[PDB]
Amino acid sequence: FEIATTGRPGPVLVDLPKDVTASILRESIPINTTLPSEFTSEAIKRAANILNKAKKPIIYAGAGILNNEQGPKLLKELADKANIPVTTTLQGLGAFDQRDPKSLDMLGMHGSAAANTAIQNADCIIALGARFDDRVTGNISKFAPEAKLAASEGRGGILHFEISPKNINKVVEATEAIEGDVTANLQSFIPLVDSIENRPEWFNKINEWKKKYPY
Amino acid sequence: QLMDDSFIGLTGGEIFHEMMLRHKVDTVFGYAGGAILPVFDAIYNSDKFKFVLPRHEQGAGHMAEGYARASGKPGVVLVTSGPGATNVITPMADALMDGVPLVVFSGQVPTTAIGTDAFQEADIVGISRSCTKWNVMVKNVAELPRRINEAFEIATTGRPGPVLVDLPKDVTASILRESIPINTTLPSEFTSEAIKRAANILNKAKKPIIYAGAGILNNEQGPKLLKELADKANIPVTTTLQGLGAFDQRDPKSLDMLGMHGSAAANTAIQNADCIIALGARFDDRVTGNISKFAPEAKLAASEGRGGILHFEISPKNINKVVEATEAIEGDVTANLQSFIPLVDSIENRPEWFNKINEWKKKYPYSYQLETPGSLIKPQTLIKEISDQAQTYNKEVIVTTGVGQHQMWAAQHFTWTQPRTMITSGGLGTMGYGLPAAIGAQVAKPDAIVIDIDGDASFNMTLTELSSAVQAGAPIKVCVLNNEEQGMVTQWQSLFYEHRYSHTHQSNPDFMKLAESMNVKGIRITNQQELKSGVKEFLDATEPVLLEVIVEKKVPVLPMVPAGKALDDFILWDAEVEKQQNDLRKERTGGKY
Amino acid sequence: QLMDDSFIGLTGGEIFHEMMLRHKVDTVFGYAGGAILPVFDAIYNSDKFKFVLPRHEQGAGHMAEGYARASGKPGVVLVTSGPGATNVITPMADALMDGVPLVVFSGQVPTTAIGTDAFQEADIVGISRSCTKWNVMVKNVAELPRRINEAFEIATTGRPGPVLVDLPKDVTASILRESIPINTTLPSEFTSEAIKRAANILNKAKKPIIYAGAGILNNEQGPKLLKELADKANIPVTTTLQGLGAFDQRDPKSLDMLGMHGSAAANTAIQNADCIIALGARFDDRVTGNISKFAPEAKLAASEGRGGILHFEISPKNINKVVEATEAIEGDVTANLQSFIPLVDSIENRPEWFNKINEWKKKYPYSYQLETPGSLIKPQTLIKEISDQAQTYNKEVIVTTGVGQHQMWAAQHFTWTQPRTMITSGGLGTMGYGLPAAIGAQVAKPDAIVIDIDGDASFNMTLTELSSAVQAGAPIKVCVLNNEEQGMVTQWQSLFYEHRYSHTHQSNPDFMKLAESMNVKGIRITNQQELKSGVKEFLDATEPVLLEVIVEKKVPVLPMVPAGKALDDFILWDAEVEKQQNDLRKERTGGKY
Ligand SMILES: Cc1cc2nc3c(=O)[nH]c(=O)nc-3n(C[C@H](O)[C@H](O)[C@H](O)COP(=O)(O)OP(=O)(O)OC[C@H]3O[C@@H](n4cnc5c(N)ncnc54)[C@H](O)[C@@H]3O)c2cc1C
Ligand SMILES: Cc1cc2nc3c(=O)[nH]c(=O)nc-3n(C[C@H](O)[C@H](O)[C@H](O)COP(=O)(O)OP(=O)(O)OC[C@H]3O[C@@H](n4cnc5c(N)ncnc54)[C@H](O)[C@@H]3O)c2cc1C
Ligand SMILES: Cc1cc2nc3c(=O)[nH]c(=O)nc-3n(C[C@H](O)[C@H](O)[C@H](O)COP(=O)(O)OP(=O)(O)OC[C@H]3O[C@@H](n4cnc5c(N)ncnc54)[C@H](O)[C@@H]3O)c2cc1C
Ligand SMILES: COC(=O)c1ccccc1S(=O)(=O)NC(=O)Nc1nc(I)cc(OC)n1
Ligand SMILES: COC(=O)c1ccccc1S(=O)(=O)NC(=O)Nc1nc(I)cc(OC)n1
Ligand SMILES: C/C(NCc1cnc(C)nc1N)=C(/S)CCOP(=O)([O-])OP(=O)([O-])O
Ligand SMILES: C/C(NCc1cnc(C)nc1N)=C(/S)CCOP(=O)([O-])OP(=O)([O-])O
Ligand SMILES: [K+]
Ligand SMILES: [K+]
Ligand SMILES: [Mg+2]
Ligand SMILES: [Mg+2]
């Protein structure tokens, strides 16, 4: 139960030989068995400084944000505070209220051309519990060119909030990797992030793309 | 017509012998035992190849690696079941990490005993799965020629590496009774477009650099084409440890070795280059420094459409594994260079770039604290002496090493000029490699001078193989840098663990009496005034020879890019810092070190 | 209350150190390297256990095995990543086959580098899976105490065997920040009915025999209870190679060792017994001879309801694996003997059976060709000399061996009287075992005489560890039987391959100069007239000592049950046959051998 539910959740299997389950316990057992960081802190601060420079930010949110009851609340709090449009994966659908004007809908192979256009043009991508799977990235070498350029010029990049080290820097290089539960790390992150009232040029583009690219 | 009956009536062992011939095997390294006897009986007094007998199967394995790296042919190993086979595991893991074509034949208990925890039974196919490209257990004699062909093919194609073929005793004793397919008795537009794209990128570059490794050594024309490219487009060249000798380090365009202990000039250049041409090298973590901070000018140039990383790589596994390639050029680097170079613009001069390259080379020599009156010989000086004197014989000079500080000083302070002359354990980093690798290289190249630059600890690991050199007629030259310490580990303990030397001083034998016991010539250099003449005696010897040199202890290898740091964030040698370090070490150890 | 915070603030390395203490570890065998530095830093200058530094990690592994077999405690190994870890694979496979509790701790590259073909990265969990009972990679410091407890528990329970715990450098450098379960910070009717049934069977037997092996050595009361049973029910006792010393061979009831090279009396007795009491032995294929022809009188008696095989075995895997047990008695053989013996009827005499047993013992001594004037010392004579002289010190005598003819002659010709005094590689049969095993046994039992009876080839494998004996203060006694051949293999080549000696004569160093170089006393016995005094000098030495004895070459170990033959279908020594064999060998090799 512990392995299934911690880190990235997933399946486990316990094989039960019939003679074991028919046998009777004859001996006492440890009572514990009868009952159910500075590095990251610095990365969060660095990540916030990057987002505070961004002129075209975008949140790319997936299933991981659903794994804490406070996840969607904190996602909304960040998008509201720093005034950031939000796209989600297939598995993140429902993490963000799609009626919100900041919603870009689903990205990817069959996602909105508005969302796909926005992430291709964003200077800062905040990846929240999503693994850059190949249905989402399109051609990997051509993925997120404005974010990669911004990373190179020290004014943006990819901020990856991910609980499983296996999925950090697996597909795309993170400018900052923030390891651990995305919801807990958002609680540290948001206070370091500057409140932004308006982004006229960016949202002007976001709004034209949404109008141009309905389903 | 498509079936062949010419092997009918032969034992599996006899078939093995015949397939070795057909694969042009001229040397086998191995050691007998019960399960492999039918094969040993078949090769008894064979005049078709040389057999080399080590004292330990680990020795056979590293010998075969040395042989393969020196010759460009696969190194063939023949050992018995059980411990004979498990003893080859370190050499297989070693060959896998360094891309060495090794074909390991291990005897196995009869098929009727497999899985019964039989006498001398190891699950070697299970154990060696992670440290081979491929392995197989032969289950009947009719498939033995096919499996031998498959082994040699897999070992030598793609990225070369080790394979293992398990031979049950009843299979190799059995006689072929049926004909077998005659084929078994005998041994792109996408990339073309990538090459064109890559050439267009290089033609824009204002700060190009070639980063060349072991893969360029895997074609005889490799170094020639590397030079042709560097000459045509006027590009400075750095190499990995494993690429040493791919480029003539006397050329002004040579930046020497890059990486953790590479030249600060090379490290500076690759950190500032707008275009990195990676030729048969895998971006291993000894080379890149902190990966997120690696090659920032090349990544910026890629983003701005005016440069990036052009990766010529034969194994898809190693493309985009560590760093994103701007263009991936898949396949043999030498063949692809033949297509690439004609598309590349000839460049006469690069004044601003080479002005920087030349200032960095001047600023960042491999500096160290020289000898002082009465001091011990410095290990850096010893290597320079060997390199200067060796270069004066009319013979090829091949260098093998152990693992540790001596290995890094050998890399830095030899002048590398010829391909397949640096034979060193890089990826796995196996202490004990140096001596058996030298025997194998010496067997491959009987007219070469072969020098094992070894550490005392490393040498201790496999010193028994000195008898093997004598028995094989291999006149290897072993130089033990005796600092009476595991220097590379004490370097880390001085630097990161406040001079707490935890179990890093093994006691050494008397190396001169050891040599005598092994019937090997022995020379001992104990002071500065014996260095030149002792090294001359060493190189002039025409028999196996062990040179022991007493060298300064507790001396760090510099430059050094520490873990976590960017490639251009290196520690440099400083005389005053070294003095302070010595005083601190003395205080902290109560004068013991 | 159920959580413990006493480890908070400690590094993984410090936690490792503390758990060694809690597990009463008094000795660690190991060798440093980069990935394991945080652990070496934590154990720096520890006065809590002795650290033993070999020259090669294979040495550490076999030392730990020797230690474990001599002490009955687990042998603890601490090595670095990559080649440090792959170098322990043969000792792990060895420990697995011989049931030796080995706890191997291997450093690993940081979790952030695993799977990247990192510097000195081996997949040791994958590689060692087949040669351990269990292994694990620790992924965070909070689980490190639990994994250490699990390792020691698995290594030492059921059939003992090797386990491996992989320790990423960032885990052992990291600091515990959270409390952990306090339990992790600290170290049948069915069988009862089978025992009763087994006793009823033995009470019917007219020709019983005890077949005792290593399992009886795994409880201090084992040999006592074995003797109590043999005395009560008046039963002759044979043992395996690994059971030697479980029964006092001076007892008239002793049949000596059975098997391929065991006494023809023991082999005859077990082939004729109506009831075989198998006590901690696994029916390995060196013991059973042709399995379908094994123990026919016991199988007949089982069918007729008046005997059979009573197998006392702790591992279900080894029950009914090779031979069908008439009654399987699962669990620790010593504990189950305590229940069994009271149900067993006391028997005063067995006139007809012991009349046969006594005639077979008289008929089947370990005969061989004695010395003649001018001949070399016979290896059988040498072993008898060592055994007779050793038995006269007021000290325990522990014997280790290499693998080959010398090992079999040691088994046959020593008189075994005490448990855990024969420490030899049996299941895997690893040449090179003898010297490091002796160092480990000597460290376990500092007041014992420890004698490595070694072959020349075997010794060559790991001779570098002589320096380790000196550095560890282990006054081991190495006797090299120098026949200048891999005698066991030449025995098979003489017998089955018409005297075709394919690569079975390795060249030897000068063993006296070798000893000198290693700072070890050296003695050389070259003729019959030096045997007694040279062996006395060897045994009287109070420092490490290497005795070389020149012995007769091309002498077979007899008796011998060849592959395919029933246990009672053995070759016996015959003087005239040996003479003819010598003449045939001479003719066939043109006088070379
Ligand atoms: C026909 C078809 C078409 C598809 N097309 C699309 C498409 O167009 N667009 C699209 O989006 N998908 C598409 N998919 C789905 C796609 O294949 C993936 O399943 C999906 O994109 C993965 O979404 P995800 O990364 O949010 O979720 P996951 O795959 O579950 O990855 C979640 C990531 O978050 C991490 N994580 C988990 N919990 C936490 C936590 N508490 N804190 C931090 N991190 C955590 C995980 O370790 C993981 O790396 C398609 C599927 C099909 C069958
Ligand atoms: C103590 C120590 C310190 C070290 N420090 C350094 C250091 O400072 N600098 C350094 O360079 N190394 C250092 N190393 C060595 C390092 O660990 C690696 O072994 C080495 O850098 C790998 O070099 P490479 O990429 O050229 O060779 P390899 O590891 O063999 O990689 C060759 C690459 O080329 C590919 N290839 C093979 N054949 C072909 C072909 N025909 N065509 C195209 N591609 C091909 C392969 O598939 C592979 O991807 C050190 C080692 C030790 C033990
Ligand atoms: C060249 C050579 C020749 C050889 N020839 C012979 C020979 O002629 N004769 C011979 O005997 N050997 C010979 N061997 C050795 C042979 O290969 C085996 O190693 C040996 O016979 C195994 O002995 P064993 O069954 O007592 O020990 P093990 O192999 O250790 O088996 C012990 C058994 O007892 C069980 N056990 C362990 N602990 C307990 C416990 N507490 N309670 C109950 N059961 C327990 C184990 O699970 C196991 O099944 C030879 C080896 C070599 C290298
Ligand atoms: C190496 O052992 C095996 O291959 C094996 C294992 C299990 C069953 C049968 C066999 S076997 O084919 O018959 N061969 C032997 O036994 N050979 C053998 N050789 C020697 I030299 C020595 C020796 O015994 C000391 N045995
Ligand atoms: C043993 O190597 C590793 O454990 C490793 C492997 C891949 C990445 C990072 C690392 S690391 O934790 O930083 N440690 C080193 O590098 N250590 C290191 N130690 C020595 I002594 C010597 C040496 O280099 C010669 N390195
Ligand atoms: C212990 C160790 N490395 C860990 C280690 C352990 N075990 C093996 C088989 N290989 C390695 N690489 C080194 S580099 C010390 C080398 O000492 P040396 O051979 O005397 O060389 P030097 O003193 O010049 O650094
Ligand atoms: C090659 C071999 N066996 C195969 C073999 C190969 N390699 C290993 C590591 N172990 C074994 N057991 C033997 S027993 C020869 C032993 O020779 P020796 O040590 O000089 O002993 P002896 O001559 O008394 O038989
Ligand atoms: K150089
Ligand atoms: K005896
Ligand atoms: Mg040294
Ligand atoms: Mg011998």
Chain-chain contact of C460 with B464 (C-beta, under 8 angstroms): yes
Q: Is B313 helix (H, G, I), strand (E, B) or coil?
A: strand
Question: Which residue in C2, C111, C112 is closest to A31 by CB distance?
Answer: C2
A107 is in an annotated binding site: yes
User: C 107-136 residues with CB below 8 A of A?
Assistant: 111-112
Q: Is B589 helix (H, G, I), strand (E, B) or coil?
A: coil
Contact B211, B333 (CB under 8 A): no
Closest Cα partner for B541 from B475, B481, B479?
B475
Could you say which of C260, C488, C518, C560 is catalytic? C488
Resolution (angstroms) equals 2.0
Which residues from B are below 8 Å from C87, CB to CB?
Answer: 90
Partners of C171 in beta bridges: none
Looking from the CA of residue C285, the nearest atom of ligand 3 is: 17
Report the distance separating Cα C49 and Cα C55, nearest Å. 20
Q: Are C421 and C239 in contact (CB under 8 A)?
A: no
Residue A101 token pair: 């004007």
Determine the Cα–Cα distance for residues A57 and B11; give it in Å rounded to an integer.
Answer: 72
Method: X-ray
**Is the distance from CB of B174 to CB of B12 less than 8 angstroms?**
yes
Could you confirm whether C224 is annotated as catalytic? no
A143 contacts in chain B (CB < 8 Å): none
B55 is in an annotated binding site: no
Q: Give the minimum alpha-carbon distance from B570 to chain C in angstroms, rounded to a whole number.
A: 19
Residue B392: other Cβ atoms inside 10 A: 10
Start-to-end CA span in chain A (Å) = 42
Contact status of C2 with chain A (Cβ, < 8 Å): yes
The rounded Å distance from CA C434 to ligand 7 centre is: 12
Which DSSP string corresponds to B191-243? HHHHHHHHHHHHTT-SSEEEEE-GGGGGSTTHHHHHHHHHHHHT--EEE-STT
Nearest CA to ligand 7 atom 4: B33
Q: What CATH code is assigned to B188-365?
A: 3.40.50.1220
Q: Is B537 a catalytic residue?
A: no
Consult the annotation and say whether A135 binds a ligand: yes
Secondary structure letter of residue C48 according to DSSP? S
Q: Is B543 an interface residue toward A (CB < 8 Å)?
A: no
Identity of the amino acid at B451: I
Rg, chain B, Cα only: 25
Domain with CATH 3.40.50.970 in chain C: 1-187, 366-593
Q: How far apart are CA B328 and CA B312, in angstroms?
A: 6
Cα–Cα distance for residue pair C467/C117, rounded to 1 Å: 34
Number of B:C CB contacts under 8 A? 239
Alpha-carbon distance of B183 to B347, in angstroms, equals 50
Q: Where are the domain boundaries for CATH 3.40.50.1220 in chain C?
A: 188-365
The active-site residue, picked from C133, C169, C477, C554, is: C169
Of B119, B206, B516, B580, which is the active-site residue? B119
Helix spans in B273-421 (H):
296-303, 333-340, 351-363, 379-390, 405-413
How far from C124 is each of B356, C87, C106, C152, CA to CA, in Å? 45, 10, 8, 19
Which atom belonging to ligand 1 lies closest to the Cα atom of A107?
9
| Phi, psi dihedral angles at C473 (to 5 degrees) | 65, 35
**CA torsion B3→B7→B12→B14, rounded to 10°?**
-150
Judged by CB atoms closer than 8 Å, whether chains meet at B299 and A145 is answered as no
Distance A172 CA to ligand 9 centre (A): 69
Distance from CA of B209 to the nearest CA of A (A): 19
Instruction: Name which residue sits closest to atom 15 of ligand 6, judged by CA.
Output: B486
**C488 labelled catalytic:** yes
Q: B366-593 belongs to which CATH class?
A: alpha beta
Q: Which fold has domain B1-187?
A: Rossmann fold (3.40.50)
Chains that touch B (3 or more CB pairs under 8 A): A, C
Cβ-Cβ contacts under 8 Å, A153 against chain B = 300, 303
Among residues B257, B255, B254, the alpha carbon closest in space to that of B244 is found at: B257
Q: Is residue B338 annotated as involved in ligand binding?
A: no
CATH classification (class only), A37-214: alpha beta
Structure-token pair, residue B154: 């897999």
Q: After which residues is chain B broken (C to N over 2.5 A)?
A: 187
Give the Å distance between the CA of B554 and the centre of ligand 10: 10
Dihedral, C503, C509, C511, C515 alpha carbons, nearest 10:
-130
Q: How many CB atoms lie within 10 A of CB A125?
A: 31
Asked whether C493 lines ligand 7 (CB < 6 A), one says no
